[PDB]
Write a structure and sequence with these properties.
Chain lengths: 481, 481, 481, 481
């Protein structure tokens, strides 16, 4: 055959169609070898050395597995080789837009460097996909294997970012709506991107994943829902789906939002902001970009990877001294110090536009405790983390279709009360972590008093160690006693 | 070179002190080789071939690991070799009282054969332990290794069943209270027995365990709580403790309370009740016992194992024809056919004694459908399942002591609201299963109509497939529409 | 009836065609739930609780996987669903003939109980398969799914035992010759039966296997070899096939031929020989058989399982006292004591007829050391184990066909010298284990002197601990110095 | 505790003493986060993203485990906390000297760039260890925790490189000789560095390790050998040690010497040779070094990592155009083309002195075939691979001390003949791989004819695909027929 075989520790032997190999063997795809999946998490979990490259091969493989399983069970769906290849390409290419240290780049750096711009890795993936196709002559290779480039490039982009704008899609009609639920599920978040990273991250972190995606694929069918053909899970798998979201949330709490992994991502972002005026990345026509402007030119963005960290760390330029000093503090493990964690008790989230006021509010708290050192706004980092089941306040399982054994092609709905009284009553919450840039004993003691007083003033939850770190502050709050 | 080493697929190489080897190499302990850990579960999960013997080795190993870890971090606890051996023996011996097919025996058979008696496997473990020690001359071997048999045999039994009767224990004092939390934790259920069966059952079932017992052991300390020294977990582990109980509940729903596993245990129990007049087990002085009376004589109970199933299946005695016919139907997979599952609404909490009228109630339902068949009491089985976090309505984490990094000796409490708003708001519920002894198509159609009608009449939850199995019944209930 | 799914810890979710489910749900197949895969090995490796039932499901699954992979890559082979079902059934039923404790029954017991008869589990499998088909009305169900029972039952039997008697097979012609190398490979022993047991045993034993059967299946094709169509492996897999046989031999050394596992199997076989005059097994028309004659009647053999061990252990019959006493010594761990291991030198090979003389020869040795104890022939057990690569003196890889990427259509041969100088120069050897029934220190000291002297007298290899156990004997042998 | 815990996917929770944390949190140690364990192997096995950093934590952990196990079983050894910390430091620090892409750097690049110098990663580890200690004020911290830096730094260096010059060591006396066998075993190569890499590489590559280092540690003791106390293994582990070397060889055959991973390392080395003049690395006093001279100054070497690859790939400088074009061909997968593999027969050995002449010899072969293209020396790469059991022609197991259970303090030697006739007769062999820098069809056809002709002329082994790639050449050699 002309298929290549790649051995992966998660999936075993992955067979790749020659069109997929041509897409993978490009500078635009190979770039993902130099972007860590968990960014700063590697500095907490040493097994987490994995890159977006191997995750992308796994997403492309699982996308192919699911569409083949549906076509084998229900030939009447008329799934073509063309459909299979287009779903695999979208799976392979949905991580193309990631920047240095993955979620650090679009979650922390671009918001602070370029607040005027609205940028996501998903839009990056669509722009990088266009640059990959056009720079490497892929459209004629697509046609050679039976694809229709105009329709199928549209279909691939829609699978990653949704409608580029009643059926809102142009790449495929309503009778193939199920194809859009495999790579990036906009309806309920159940997709092969999560299935790969749960298993891969768990393998590398040394933590346990409870989600059985092979069982899910075996039980998956397509059903009619409101004039669309969609993916329906077997009714009895509903508990396994609730457990999938519980697992996702558990992996966010223990690993992806680890308090020290997040501070290392914050310190790396700070070094990038201090380096951004001085690093030059050449793009199209020899034009020079910066870390923050390389997102505007895919030829420049192609060369923007975790390498930026080492380019700064190893620099001799006096201009890069400040950026270099922050990364040196990461190496000596002189990190900003974790003060504590709290949650809002209210139902209205802290909004992103309020994030910058929060350090001033902590510094404005007046703890009734003797303090030697006085801290300022600039001494505090306040990190707000949205934890949910992928749909804000909504239950994603209310947006899943199920079938029963007696009518395997008829969609039904299952409510939370039909499953268990032991499930969550709420599907979204915020975590607030506070850190201090002053690392001495006296500064950290003070930071704790300001923190717990701010919690009390804002009616947030009592920090788990509140009575130990702030014994004179916690008694003032009756809700805490 | 006095110790023996056993290779276990869960724990790797387990070292056993010579005293432990002498206890294991007895007819009373080796009997656990012939009792399946999951009983009827093996007939649904063919990986689940494992027996109570290998689970017991694991419990004794983990009990040793925890007591050694505590002694090591806190030498001021004065943990002795004597304390370590007594904890390991209680760990190895806490499963000794299990009968044929494990929880089938004390969960289904003894309650129906001997309703007057209050029998648990734990009381069995204490009686079997006494018989093991006395039949095999163990007390002199205990003295040889520094144990004081009067105090230490009391300690071992108390670790399994609790106070044999202000400090209610005689085996060890208040300053060693923590030792009583290792093998069977009566305060919150967090103990090494669960840690072994999560990891061992997951390995055999082919399902994944997320609980990292090694991490928990590494972070565990002893703290002063109300004039006792108790085990305190690091504050940061509180999320991992909620996950442990989530995993336990997930394993109950998927595996231990599998609808078909439960009906096979029900059919085996029915065969045992029909064989009980005829089967003989030889006990002390050649006296004959029955399946139901072997619990009264430890020499007889020693020979009461899963072998009873095959003695019935292979019998030629006409008296055993009815018992043998039930087991033959298991082999042909002619099982009582699953009709569906429902839940009580409100706080309707069947605490037992109504199990007898439930089949009559289903048959008394009047579904508004044309049926060719009419079924009665003898055609229905109704199973009640209590699902909880081990303490009925209570949150076990409210009964855990934590410590913080800044004051490792100060016990604190952590409430659900200090952890996450995404946790369960309830910790207990009931499931109701219904099955039909008639297996033909006409009888199964009728049984479905009676079932869904009964659910509607009792205001139970709508069965997940209700609209497909009973399309003419479901519209009568508006709460369902 | 539709597909069933069984969750297996080795293979994950196995889908079973309704015809396969009907074959599995019979007393003849379900019997395999009560036969331990590794027999006495469970008494050394407590993870090894697995039975022939779950191994058989795995063999049927892998047989399906390989035939599907060949048919997918080479549609010109004309592989039919009929062919796939027949291969799966042969895979499922190849273990049907196993007796109590698997290889102990046909390897040790039947040869000693019935030396006149030639019995193998393979012949048993064919007889049990015939009994299963005829007793359970399978033929009509076969016809319903497109099988032709006359040809296809012949084909199934030939896959298990070979030609029942130029092409020697009647079930399929030469153009489907490759179908006969999947379930039981008579040409080189590379088959799906080994692939399942390596992975299953390793998972249960707690030991690691290096054989990637998925990779092998991915690279497998069918090639013309001397006017047959045979399975050909990719050239690059030749190293992995040498490693497969090294792994098998390693698992035999560590596990299947463990010295203590083998002595437990020896003691069980002795108990069975002592019980054989007295145990009655009812077969067809109420005729009575013995353990050794149940092989003559499949209705009797259906009820001959590991249960016979417990029937003896729990017996009160004075006739069974001697048999029962041996099994009681196993429970107390009063086993015959391993003295040592040696090998014949040069090409010297001990014949089966001479096994019985070996205990007398050891007892006839004259150590030339002062002993207070004299041992007799009856005090020694001598176990002779033939270790090979499954074809006696032959290299099985000389009987593999390979293909290169430059010409997938040209079958080639690869010699040992084309692969590595680090491979074995011999493919068969014999190990001789000696054990002593007298366990006291004086008796074992003496047994050691007799053993090392016998080795010296026969010119066998120096036992590894020779100089320590027999320091006065080892210097007399110059070939050892 | 002031101990840190690191979660590792191979070892679980690793506890680190504060002195070890101070050594790890340095630029010299953290550098190992940017060196791939398997270099070019990542470009063949996408799971192999792991770096030397996490391997080094595992080696330090296992070194601790082994020394603690010996001290617990044999307190009379008088193993001190000082001994344990010195062994852990040597374990952590033995990989410090690795350069970019690990074995590529000292195996391929330095020998070609600086043929006059004799450099190994081991010498690098000692020089960087000295730089780490001196640059970061570690000597005072060592004294604070009871180390004596004069003796103990000597001891650490000797563990990595051997005697810095019959007891040849100065760091510890003969009665602690066993300490020198833990991190880098110069006597037989059985050490904790291999144990970590087998498990860690197998986990990432997705291939299986069968070496059980925990079992080995459990059975290890210290014995008297020629006035030294050395590590003695249990005699029964001799089979498992032969298997350890077999696994090592298999990992080299499949992974570390993969033909494509080796050609990618060759192409990276070629890019580094083309860039060596132009890349400037600042060392001590602002002096500038090259890639090839950074080994001369540890301040420069600290900044020499896999980053060099990306600095070249992302350069715009015309000086780096040639180097950059080689790396761009790697990204497009336009690699030098593998022609074939052969071996010298019997004891024939190619020495390093031969390596440069080999391409000319292949080009000098005169295949009797019509060729369109004529190839030159410059068009061929010839890679010579030494495969052995770590001691050239010698059997490492002849250099192991064993002990038997009858006398645990008596060291014994076990020969190959006392173990098995199925073991290797030879412990060293050579592979010769030939590649072509011309990648078109006509040049590859020609290269194959020259290669197979050269094999025939030198009496090398027939390439496995010889009959297919060179059907007109193979007939000249009758031994090849
Ligand atoms: N599990 C496993 N994977 C292997 C082994 N050898 C290589 N691989 C992996 C490395 C790659 O991810 C993948 C493909 O390498 P292969 O040696 O199968 O093919 P390659 O293209 O190098 O050779 P070819 O062009 O077919 O001659 O398989 C092995 O023995 N076991
Ligand atoms: N992982 C592993 N387990 C093994 C191996 N050989 C034996 N075992 C298992 C079987 C038992 O559960 C445990 C102890 O068996 P051994 O063969 O070490 O001890 P045995 O008592 O037969 O020998 P001994 O009394 O020490 O001469 O280890 C092996 O090579 N690998
Ligand atoms: N991995 C895994 N296996 C499960 C789970 N639930 C059941 N199994 C296993 C048990 C059986 O070997 C296999 C199929 O059992 P199911 O519960 O799917 O089938 P059952 O015949 O009870 O249900 P059905 O006839 O389809 O209503 O899967 C689960 O949540 N995860
Ligand atoms: N297996 C496992 N590892 C975890 C989990 N949370 C964190 N880790 C890993 C990350 C690190 O490699 C190691 C120690 O991390 P911790 O979060 O326990 O330590 P950290 O220094 O952040 O907390 P501390 O200074 O003790 O408050 O454990 C978890 O839930 N499970």
């Amino acid at each position: 055959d002309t298929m290549k075989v790649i051995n992966d520790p998660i999936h075993g032997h992955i067979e790749l169609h020659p069109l997929l190999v041509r897409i993978i063997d490009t500078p635009q795809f190979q770039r993902l070898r130099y972007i860590k999946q968990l960014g700063g998490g590697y500095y907490v979990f040493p097994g987490a050395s994995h890159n977006r490259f191997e995750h992308s091969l796994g997403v492309g493989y699982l996308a192919g597995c699911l569409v083949h399983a549906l076509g084998e069970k229900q030939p009447e769906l008329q799934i073509s080789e063309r459909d299979v290849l287009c779903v695999q390409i979208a799976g392979l290419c949905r991580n193309l837009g990631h920047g240095p240290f993955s979620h650090m780049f679009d979650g922390r750096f671009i918001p602070l460097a370029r607040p005027e711009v609205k940028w996501t890795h998903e839009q990056g993936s669509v722009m990088m996909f266009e640059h990959l196709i056009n720079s490497n002559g892929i459209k004629p290779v697509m046609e050679q294997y039976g694809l229709i480039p105009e329709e199928d490039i549209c279909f691939i982009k829609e699978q990653i970012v949704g409608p580029l704008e009643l059926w809102p899609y142009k790449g495929r009609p309503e009778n193939k709506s199920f194809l859009y639920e495999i790579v990036s599920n906009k309806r309920n978040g159940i997709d092969v991107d999560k299935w790969d990273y749960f298993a891969r991250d768990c393998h590398h972190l040394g933590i346990q994943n409870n989600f059985d995606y092979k069982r899910f694929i075996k039980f998956a069918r397509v059903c009619e829902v409101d004039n669309e053909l969609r993916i329906c899970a077997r009714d009895k798998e509903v508990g396994n789906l609730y457990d999938m979201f519980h697992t996702c949330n558990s992996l966010h709490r223990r690993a992806y939002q680890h308090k020290v992994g997040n501070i290392i991502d914050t310190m790396i972002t700070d070094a990038f902001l201090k380096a951004d005026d001085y690093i030059e990345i050449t793009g199209a026509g020899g034009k020079k970009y910066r870390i923050s402007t390389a997102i505007d030119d895919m030829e420049a963005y192609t060369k923007l990877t975790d390498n930026i960290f080492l380019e700064i760390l190893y620099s001799t330029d006096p201009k890069l001294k400040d950026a270099r000093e922050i990364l040196k503090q990461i190496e000596y493990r002189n990190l900003f110090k974790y003060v504590g964690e709290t949650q809002p008790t209210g139902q209205i989230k802290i909004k992103r536009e309020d994030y910058e006021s929060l350090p001033k509010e902590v510094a404005s708290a007046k703890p009734k405790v003797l303090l030697d050192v006085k801290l300022k706004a600039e001494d505090f980092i306040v990190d707000v983390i949205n934890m949910d089941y992928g749909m804000q306040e909504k239950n994603p399982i209310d947006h899943v279709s199920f079938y029963c054994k007696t009518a395997p092609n008829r969609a039904i709905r299952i409510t939370k009360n039909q499953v268990s009284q032991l499930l969550p009553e709420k599907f979204a919450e915020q975590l607030i972590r506070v850190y201090c840039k002053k690392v001495d004993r006296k500064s950290l003691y003070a930071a704790r008093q300001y923190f717990v007083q701010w919690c009390a003033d804002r009616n947030f939850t009592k920090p788990q160690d509140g009575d130990v770190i702030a014994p004179l502050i916690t008694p003032q709050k009756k809700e805490w006693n």
